[model samples]
Target: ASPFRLASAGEISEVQGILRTAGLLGPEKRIAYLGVLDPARGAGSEAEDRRFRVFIHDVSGARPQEVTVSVTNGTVISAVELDTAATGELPVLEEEFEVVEQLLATDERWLKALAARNLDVSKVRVAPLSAGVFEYAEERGRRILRGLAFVQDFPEDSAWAHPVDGLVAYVDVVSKEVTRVIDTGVFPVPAEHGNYTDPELTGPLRTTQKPISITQPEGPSFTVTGGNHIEWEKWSLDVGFDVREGVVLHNIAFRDGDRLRPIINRASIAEMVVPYGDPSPIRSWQNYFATGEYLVGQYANSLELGCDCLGDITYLSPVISDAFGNPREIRNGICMHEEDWGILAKHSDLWSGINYTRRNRRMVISFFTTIGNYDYGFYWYLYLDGTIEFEAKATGVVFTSAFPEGGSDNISQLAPGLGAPFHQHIFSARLDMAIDGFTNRVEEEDVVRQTMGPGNERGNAFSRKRTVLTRESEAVREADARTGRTWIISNPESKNRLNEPVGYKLHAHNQPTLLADPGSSIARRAAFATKDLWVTRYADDERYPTGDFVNQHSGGAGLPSYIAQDRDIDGQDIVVWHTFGLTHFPRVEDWPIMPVDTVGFKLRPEGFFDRSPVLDVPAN
Candidate 1:
């Protein structure tokens, strides 16, 4: 119960000085914090004593209230002010895109179109354009603050490069102007050989090899207790942060030997669209959902020790809450480490000729987030045999589009008139299972191919079946790869020792399901990308699959409206989701920068460990 901590910095300055001495802070009210919500059940015994709650929003008067304060060791005790509506404002920050790039560099029509392209209105750059070129705006009825701009080319050795016939402004963040501008007349030329700080794109790849250390000797196996929990060996969880889910693990657990089990009682990443293939209308409404239109933990990225992470790391920090609710903090947004994980198992006992190997050791927990021309990163891991993975990589730059008639044979040019379209990054995750004890179930298995009757009298045999999803309208599946399906999650009163049941499965590789057009509008606002596994039943506010206010949100609020209420999920309390992705199509080595490209999902431990739980691991 006491493992869900995250709120110090003197407890977020004593809950903003108890919401500014109960006047609920002022300057026309503010505070958006929204963290520390623990307790849906299980913060009960350690001699009891835990209270936190927090969740804020207030936003002064014209709407947006929902407060709920309540601290305990730092004082507050209760603040309330429960409901109100209009939640909007909160994305659009980096100093409001540096005031929309200093009012589009003092626009004289964008400085005479960047001095007629001799460029340099302070090297251009501007950005913010997630679900912007309109998907709804409003003014008298209240919503208008809008954003959209996207110009680049900041070259002064900074070599930024994003100019595929640039210019698309539109702004209006409460009238800081730049109301409109389209100009996509294809302007090419900005490819400085895909500048990645050009040394002819990385000085002939210089690398004399040898430099890869990881030493933990007797140190970090993993354990971080109250400052965001974590525990490692038999895994344990509770990390947090989420101005749109950038990392938030919470109550994980897994000890298995003397029982501590209960796997995912909440994991994050619930949305991330990307969609673009340039059907033009300003690149076909570009389709982003980048963690519900930008907030990926307020653009995390502050991790760098051995460059982003490698062995002995730990970092953590988080806090967030700006948009004037103040709070800030984000340091190393999250990092933690441990990683050796190379050969998880190997053997060669040819009739007692012995050989055995083991070298595996995960426990990652990363975070990166960027969203303006990519840079994701995620990670999560935790292995030591009982798996858990989650991955998601995708490295920066490649949102090109602007062919100008000189190119096009369907996107992918990357230089001349610039193209690179065809996109689909997708991504989903939202687990929430809690197996051994959460009334679990969800089956599916598959494997197929066993046609010629009587246990397959040679139809090239294969077999395997399972099924059991009893509801959520047959638990939407998909991910066949020739029937190797997967998705388990069992528990039906736990088992093992031959009586199978206690489970976990859920694999996923490569992915790729939604290529838009499921009655498009980015496939009905990413209907949880149509299907790649869903399982639903546990409902604690159905946590975003495309819902919980995805700005400009319309397509029926997430997991096709959380499985349209088919409910009953077998032994209930479930909540899977999944949906991995890729479909990228763009290549030319993915233009300036883009290389990572990962995508994930794992979960493993099928009969929920009764044996090789790293069989005492050690063969170092």
Candidate 2:
């Protein structure tokens, strides 16, 4: 087992016992495990071991305090208090959903409202809202949970398609009380005849051909070294699952002949935003930062063979903690497999009567996280030609709002009464590029069309303008399709045989910029999505693009704040933040279930090698 593995159940128990013995766990207090922390890079000889940290919340006292416990070989060495605030724990747990539902069921105000509408509280489905709830908690200085209600068993594919209409509830999780209820007059209920389970309504296409099968005659070509370390072909990296980021890759390096070249130190989906376009009071405040609010890795569903992944797949389980700090396993939270990537390279010569072709094969590490009604699939592809692709796919039912009768001009009707409002799904990835070495520089390249002046009189000539971003202030840029803009991270000292800088080119593709108004609250909270790319000097504490405490943050702290320092970025360790977004305009075909919509970017070799590195690949 890797020394960096997560704390075991026994280890967690030992840590808890030590804290309890020290009189830290009282009746009015709580302990929430933050996670195991690896020692600093250069902490003398003692930096070789691992330790665990927990948040000690004194409900009846002052602010919460963090406790650090050192451990080795399943033994607790020492337990001490750390000077830090309680953070990183889940704002709510799955079990708390029942508490919220029960509180609403017993509340007299909610009961009266349900009775007036001729509805039963037993059939109502309540779901926690993300940013909408967390903002209230921060402003009120207490732990609060907000939920939206939908009518259940209403002959629909999903309760979301039949929202209870303008009904919202707030709960104090610690007290288990319904603090407030907002009822904005009910909208007319459409006829209940839209069950998605009906075969005629939504089903796979009927084909007369036989079924297809994929067989790996020689078995998988990859190996899982030490539980979390994956080694395939020339690619080697450590895989980990975070409570916020689903799949994380650490120390990713590729073997270049006999030398191992470092590509990325770490990479992950830092944060995401899904902002709705409706202007109503209940719908206007629906900007959700799913990763920060709910924690994507915690909601990762277990994968099944031949269903979620194909071929010979290696499944890895992730250990996560509940809100109360109890550790449990989420089995098969990540899946890794090899795939056939069609033709890698091909060439034909008619005069010489020569033809050549080679099959492309690559390794894929993937996982899926369901945030409420939507499912987001994340994938990392390691290609044979020294390219890494990060992709995000969105699917699942759209979050719908009820449209009152004759009030249809303001929304896109996905179904009978389901108003599938416009929204933007923006995902930002943090890339710690260590190309060749740690110190690197970013250069923006733009393809410009030349005027009819120079040597060529014809006005069809074009050239590229390359400018090195020497400081952080000049690194924040947006993509331009007309200019064919792309960025490159390169080592100034490293050069290829042609005397060109060795590096990787980052190409952001098929991703739309944030469509929200520049001065709007949604745009301010998610300022990282304002541009397609951002480059900053590396900082240990700056992992999240949208600040650490995104929960009710009023518009400061993420990429916008990080870049405000305007530090020099030339020839220093650097990090790149890239944002990918999809402006979704709902359609009828997306009613029952939305098909997968993929948007991402690519990192490919640019003068990193003298020639094609995969030219020696054998034919299939």
lDDT assessment of candidate 2: 0.76
- Identify the runs in model 2 with alpha carbons over 4 angstroms from their true place: 1-33, 38-47, 52-62, 65-69, 73-90, 131-138, 154-157, 200-209, 407-410
What's the count of clashing pairs in each model shown?
Answer: 2, 0
What residue pairs clash in candidate 2, if any at all? none
> Residue 566 in model 2: shift from native, Å?
2.0
Give the range where candidate 2 is weakest over 10 consecutive residues by summed lDDT: 82-91
Error of 1 at 36 (Å): 4.4
Write down the worst ten-residue block by lDDT for model 1. 139-148
Cα-based RMSD of candidate 2: 3.3
Local distance difference test, each candidate: 0.69, 0.76
lDDT of 1: 0.69
The top-ranked prediction according to lDDT is 2
> Per-residue lDDT of 288-385 in model 2, one digit per residue for the tens?
78787666887898988888998888898878765555667888888999989999999898998889999998899998989779999999999999
